Amino acid sequence: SGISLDNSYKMDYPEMGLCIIINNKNFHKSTGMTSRSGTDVDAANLRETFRNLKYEVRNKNDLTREEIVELMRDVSKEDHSKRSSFVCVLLSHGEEGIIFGTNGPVDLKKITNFFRGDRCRSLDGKPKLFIIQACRGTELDCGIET
Amino acid sequence: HKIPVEADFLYAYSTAPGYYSWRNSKDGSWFIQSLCAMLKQYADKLEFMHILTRVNRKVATEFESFSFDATFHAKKQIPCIVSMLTKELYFYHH
């Protein structure tokens, strides 16, 4: 053939891939975390948006820290050979480096480690996207007038 | 012969390190509603980093908190793109 270039990810596998949406709205009372009003609007919007990008969307609601870790473990052990990419959306409370299950925190590193190149071989060289709506601390941006 | 195990991840954070992130109880979160809008408008047109840059500008310019509590009133937000990707990402092909 003619000259070839390799600057863009191959996105024409038979499937775009999974879009896992974790929508944590209601938290165990003992945690003292407030309900996240408006998050269902987010989850519905994301489902429709990634549906139209041809992702296989899976919505999950109000998962404990244990359920989050097992879900990511299970998904990372699927065969993604026929999939172009992987997307995970996390909607929850958080702080720096952490997102909350309904009953306590999960290290973001624990979640993303399942998809490491050496731990998820069928996603090697494929884009792995983590979209995180959660706090990263308690600082507030006062802004500056333009 | 090897690639880094941390290669080919992208973290689209709603907010900068150390900061709160804002969610409207009626409209949804500033970041997710801007992200979906820009994906809707530009996923057949722009590379993903340029889409997320439009998301940064939308959140930065169009949103400001309203609160009866002076501590939480009139605050702004910038999202935070963290890319370990090794190639451009287009959601379309051919």
Binding site: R36, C135 | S14
Partner: peptide, 4 residues
């Protein structure tokens, strides 16, 4: 407007 609420924080996360």
């Amino acid at each position: 407007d609420e924080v996360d």
